[PDB]
Amino acid sequence: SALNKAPGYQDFPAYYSDSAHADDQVTHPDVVVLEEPWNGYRYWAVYTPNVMRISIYENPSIVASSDGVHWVEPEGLSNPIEPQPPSTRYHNCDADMVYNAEYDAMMAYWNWADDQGGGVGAEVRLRISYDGVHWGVPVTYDEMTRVWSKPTSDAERQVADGEDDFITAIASPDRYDMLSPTIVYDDFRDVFILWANNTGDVGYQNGQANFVEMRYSDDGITWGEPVRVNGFLGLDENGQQLAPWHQDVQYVPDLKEFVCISQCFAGRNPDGSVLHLTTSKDGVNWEQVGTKPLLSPGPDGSWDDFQIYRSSFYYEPGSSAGDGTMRVWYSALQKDTNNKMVADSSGNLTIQAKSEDDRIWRIGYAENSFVEMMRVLLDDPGYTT
Numbered sequence: 001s002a003l004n005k006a007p008g009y010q011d012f013p014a015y016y017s018d019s020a021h022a023d024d025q026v027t028h029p030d031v032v033v034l035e036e037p038w039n040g041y042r043y044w045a046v047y048t049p050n051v052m053r054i055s056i057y058e059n060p061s062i063v064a065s066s067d068g069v070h071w072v073e074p075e076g077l078s079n080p081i082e083p084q085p086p087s088t089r090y091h092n093c094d095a096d097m098v099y100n101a102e103y104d105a106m107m108a109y110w111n112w113a114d115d116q117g118g119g120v121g122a123e124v125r126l127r128i129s130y131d132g133v134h135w136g137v138p139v140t141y142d143e144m145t146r147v148w149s150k151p152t153s154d155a156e157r158q159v160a161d162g163e164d165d166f167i168t169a170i171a172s173p174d175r176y177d178m179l180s181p182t183i184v185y186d187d188f189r190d191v192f193i194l195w196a197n198n199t200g201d202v203g204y205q206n207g208q209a210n211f212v213e214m215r216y217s218d219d220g221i222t223w224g225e226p227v228r229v230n231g232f233l234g235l236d237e238n239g240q241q242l243a244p245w246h247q248d249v250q251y252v253p254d255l256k257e258f259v260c261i262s263q264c265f266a267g268r269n270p271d272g273s274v275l276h277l278t279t280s281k282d283g284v285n286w287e288q289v290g291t292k293p294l295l296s297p298g299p300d301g302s303w304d305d306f307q308i309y310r311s312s313f314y315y316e317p318g319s320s321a322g323d324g325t326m327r328v329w330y331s332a333l334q335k336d337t338n339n340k341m342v343a344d345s346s347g348n349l350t351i352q353a354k355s356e357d358d359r360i361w362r363i364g365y366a367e368n369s370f371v372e373m374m375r376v377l378l379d380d381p382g383y384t385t
């Protein structure tokens with residue numbers, strides 16, 4: 001196996017309470033792993049609750065951990081960090097978070113859509129935090145200039161964190177052309193990079209017409225014009241082209257390259273999607289690693305038996321160069337779940353799925369040696385970095 005899935009899944013809290021849906025359904029994690037603790041913890045994650053049929057609960061939420069396994073809501077934090085929309089016309093999705101070393105602050109991005117055709121389109125929005133508890137607009141950010149000035153005291157390391165306290169990073173008049181934004185700070189060129197999937201004004205059924213675009217920014221706040229990446233995905237084991245749905249990118253210093261885990265598909269839409277691995281020296285020009293999937297749905301009846309959904313990763317360096325560990329927080333869905341018993345996070349059959357749970361959404365974990373992963377992907381038992 002390219003990655004070894006951990007048994008069960010991880011417990012993430014979801015704020016919602018809805019009688020027609022099992023609690024604590026969640027997707028699309030984005031994890032930040034640090035060398036040293038930030039506001040008490042070395043692991044920070046943003047994620048969104050989600051259920052079938054209604055997207056209104058899909059609101060950026062934060063947890064922290066000391067281990068990447070057991071997640072807690074920091075003391076004083078109220079999830080979601082971005083409020084529930086006022087109606088089902090609108091929904092949030094697709095969170096991704098970066099640690100900004102210069103400001104010693106987290107930058108949490110997400111996608112907001114007006115889903116009404118002929119509506120206003122969509123936006124990539126941003127809330128920043130200094131303390132891990134309050135997420136919003138820095139008090140030394142000037143909305144007129146869009147400049148985030150570095151704090152010059154502890155008192156300036158504060159945010160406004162009300163319901164309207166976000167930054168619009170990007171706007172588009174189409175609804176679905178900036179899906180799954182993923183941000184990396186390139187410390188060579190000294191620029192923020194954001195990759196997103198362009199599904200036009202169509203979305204989930206756009207399919208093989210999907211393509212990824214990148215944008216550049218000096219600060220992470222104001223972004224330039226998009227340009228298409230090249231070579232993002234390749235052929236699968238049948239020789240069939242893969243198309244993007246959702247993705248996470250990392251710059252990996254130990255590998256001297258950008259690495260991306262892509263939730264992708266060979267058919268008409270992301271049903272049954274798998275993960276593939278793709279890499280790039282520059283962020284622009286990519287090549288898929290092997291023909292084989294990095295992660296696939298589990299067997300019938302498993303919590304991940306429908307599709308693998310958007311996943312986040314960290315390359316943990318080893319003691320030797322080029323010999324690290326791939327750590328993957330993967331989201332997934334189970335099919336055919338209405339009124340059925342489903343697994344808890346320990347893998348025990350203790351949860352009753354509810355009447356409108358057509359599927360169940362959870363976040364779990366998988367891991368492998370980077371070298372062993374590459375050996376499986378490339379069908380090369382002797383690969384070494």
Ligand SMILES: C[C@@H]1O[C@@H](O[C@@H]2[C@@H](O[C@H]3O[C@H](CO)[C@H](O)[C@H](O)[C@H]3O)[C@@H](O)[C@@H](CO)O[C@H]2O)[C@@H](O)[C@H](O)[C@@H]1O
Binds near residue numbers: 053054056202
């Ligand atoms: C309930 C329904 O939910 C959303 O549509 C889902 C769709 O959601 C994904 O794709 C749309 C674009 O088509 C957005 O990017 C979402 O952030 C994605 O999660 C898929 O799940 C398809 C699967 O068949 O089902 C649609 O109903 C939302 O766009 C709708 O407005 C509505 O809220």
Ligand SMILES: [Ca+2]
Binds near residue numbers: 028093094246
């Ligand atoms: Ca999404």
Ligand SMILES: [Ca+2]
Binds near residue numbers: 030
């Ligand atoms: Ca990320």
Ligand SMILES: [Ca+2]
Binds near residue numbers: 230231
């Ligand atoms: Ca091209």
Ligand SMILES: [Ca+2]
Binds near residue numbers: 231
């Ligand atoms: Ca190609």
